[PDB]
Amino acid sequence: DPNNIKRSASYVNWHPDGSVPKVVVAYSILQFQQQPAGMPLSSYIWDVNNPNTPEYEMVPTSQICCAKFNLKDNNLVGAGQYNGQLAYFDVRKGNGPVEATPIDISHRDPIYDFAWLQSKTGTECMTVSTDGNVLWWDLRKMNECVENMPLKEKNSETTVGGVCLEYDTNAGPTNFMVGTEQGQIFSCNRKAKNPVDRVKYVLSGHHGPIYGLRRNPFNSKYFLSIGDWTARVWVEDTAVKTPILTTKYHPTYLTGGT
Amino acid sequence: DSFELDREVIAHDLEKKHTDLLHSYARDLKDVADLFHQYKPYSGAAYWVRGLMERIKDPMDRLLTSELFREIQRTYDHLWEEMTEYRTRAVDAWCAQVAATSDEKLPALVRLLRETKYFLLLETSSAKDLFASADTFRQQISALDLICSIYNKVQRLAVEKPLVQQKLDAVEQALNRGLAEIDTYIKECMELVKDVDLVLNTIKDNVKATQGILFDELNDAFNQLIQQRHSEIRDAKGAASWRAYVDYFSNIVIDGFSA
Amino acid sequence: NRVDSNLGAISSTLLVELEGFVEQNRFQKKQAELLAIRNEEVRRAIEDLYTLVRNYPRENTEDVLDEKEVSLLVRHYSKNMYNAIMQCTLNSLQA
Structure with missing residues (x-):
């Protein structure tokens, strides 16, 4: 629409049921001196049945990014922001935060995420x-940090970023990777069978600021x-801390796909 | 090196294809050179530099494990060499910029704390400056208390005309105003805490306004009298304003009870 | 697609479906918005097409301006193909 002006779309997520062609979209601007x-x-x-003026508009209190959806349903939607302030919205009100995840001590930083865990019969999240300080929040009842572990590298430079984390396509007991932006993919499990360092x-081996991460589906890992x-x-x-099918060295610095 | 089988029988097949590596490194050397000098936070520039630089460091290692190698040595020389010149002058210029913005501080804050974190991350992969960074982060606690104070200024009144006409909050406001132009900041935070208590007094005024907002005629008269008695008890020009609020209550009761 | 998957489906609709006929009135509310919705995008789409043809380096065009009156002819063909839509829909309906 002609309001989708001066605002880069810095995500697009897709609605999870089958024959609903809706898209949830997500528009922002970083490098915030501008x-x-x-x-x-x-x-x-938006919908694809008609290129409708946006069915519902979600108004945050700051610059929405990374706005994932709620898993397999026609109700609810998450979001990210720039403070750290998560968000949460239902479909029968075109309004602001249904349950704004508040400020507490730790996470006061820009969030590129709103990633769901398979917490069954309920809802969940992480950032x-x-x-x-990747910081899990609550389920259904939302206001508390569950397993609020500021994570830490083994040799104590704990300012370790991330983008676009991926889970398990085999039933998902909390094994995942975090797309850490300094050129080094990190990974975790959260069930510390060892001490808390996991x-x-x-x-x-990957190069510079990393922008991609995805497991492969349809047969394997x-x-x-x-x-x-x-x-x-x-x-x-x-034993394979190195690629398999390296493909082309390109022009035009890469930024994202799956 | 899933084979290497050096002979005098392979060799005269692979001079031309070690040459082919030399020309292929030159061709994507010009893709790098095109992308570099065409698209030539703040620290995205140093990441631009050292991304491409350790990127290009790996091929010179790969080749050098001699006729084309002289011209590849020409391009490699200055291109690798001046790009280090840019990273050097970049840290010079933004040492100047951190220094000057720090001086003005005594937006800019989010930029400079993000920048100090980011080339700090680089330089482990000034001291007074980082002390002050820790100070204004532990005061970012009370800079997130300033936002509570400014909210409180926002929602803080025709009902509140009585109390504000009788309140002496301007003395604490004048203490903040003399503060508005070390441990002074900390004691002013406790002053803010006392002012937040006065904000709780303002919202107690709001709550009493809202509870004054809302045969069987005896029951209705008893309910109205109970609401008025609750407002009057919860109260303690002031007598006149109390009478005015009671009259507005009576008018609202006549408006609602005539339906 | 954007200029002839619409205008060959706008001319594919069927307004009146199968007293109680007031439901038809209600029914003919709904699809009305349909055609209106579709039309807007085509009034968008042809419009956007012009911007694409205008904004492009082509160093041998910075001394030859684009003309006008045939762009108004492109616009006019868009109008008349809307009209062909609606007359096809109405005649099929009355049939």
Whole structure:
């Protein structure tokens, strides 16, 4: 629409049921010294049956990014922001925060996430920032940090970023990777059978600020690394800390796919 | 090196294809050179530099494990070399910029704390400045108390005309105003806490306004008298304003009870 | 697609469906918005097409301006193909 002006779309997520062609979209501007003196942002939901003026508009209190949805339902939607302030919205009101996840002590940093855990018969979440402190929040009842562990690298430079984390396509007991932006993919499990230090993998070898991460589906577990302007394919073993099907060194610095 | 089998039988097949590596490194060397000098936070620039630089460091290692190699040595020389010149002058210029913005501080804050974190991350991969960073982060606690204070200024009144006409909050406001132009900040935070208590007094005024907002005629008269008695008890020009609020209550009761 | 998946489905609709006929009135509310909705995008789409043809370097065009009157002819063909839509829909309806 002609309000979708001066506002980069810095995500698009897709609605999860089958024959609902809706898209939830997510519009922002970073490098915030040119934070736009105009529009405070409000994302949207478009439909493909008609290119309708956005069915519902979600108005946040700050710059919406990364706005994932709620899993397999026609009700609810999450979001991210720039403070750290998560958000949460239902479909029968075109308004602001249904349950704004508040400020508490730790997470006061830009969030590129709103990632769901498979907490059955309920809802859940986690975040990631340019401080490190990946900080799980609550389920259904929302206001508390569940397993609020500021994570820490083994040799104590805990400002370890992330983007675009991926879970398990085999039933999902909390094994995941975090797309850490300094050129080193990290990984975790959260069930510390060991002490609380459980960040095994630094897969150093990708280049510069990483922008891609995805497991592969449809048969196996081989994950991807499309982040910098080389588009690899990586593998998860303790002996293969290096690609498998490296593909082309490109022009035009890469930024994202799956 | 899934084979290497050096002979005098392979060799005269692979001079031309070690040459082909030399020309392919030159061709994507010009893709790097095109992308570099065409698209030539703040620290995205140093990441631009050292991304491409350790990127290009790996190929020189790969080749050098001699006729084309001289011209590849030419391009490699200055291109690798001046790009280090840019990273050097970049840290010079933004040492100047952090220094000057720090001086003005005694927006800019979010930029400079993000920048100090980011080349700090780089330089482990001034001291007074980082002390002050820790100070204004532990005072970011009370800078998130300033936002509570400014909210409180926002929602803080025709009902509140009585109390404000009788309140002496301007003395604490004048203490903040003399503060508006070390431990002074900390004691002013406790002054804010006392002022937040006065904000709780303002919202107690709001709550009493809202509860004054809302045969069987004896029951209705008893309910109205109970609401008025609750307002009057919860109260303690002031007598005149109390009478005015009671008259507005009576008018509202006549408006609602005539339906 | 954007200029002829609409205008070959706008001319594919069927307004009146199968006293109680007031439901038809209600029914003919709904699809009304349909055609209106579709029309807006085509009034968008042809419009956007012009911007695409205008904004492009082509160093041998910065001394030859684009003309006008045939762009008004492109616009006019868009209008008349809307009209062909609606007359097809109405005649099929009355049939």
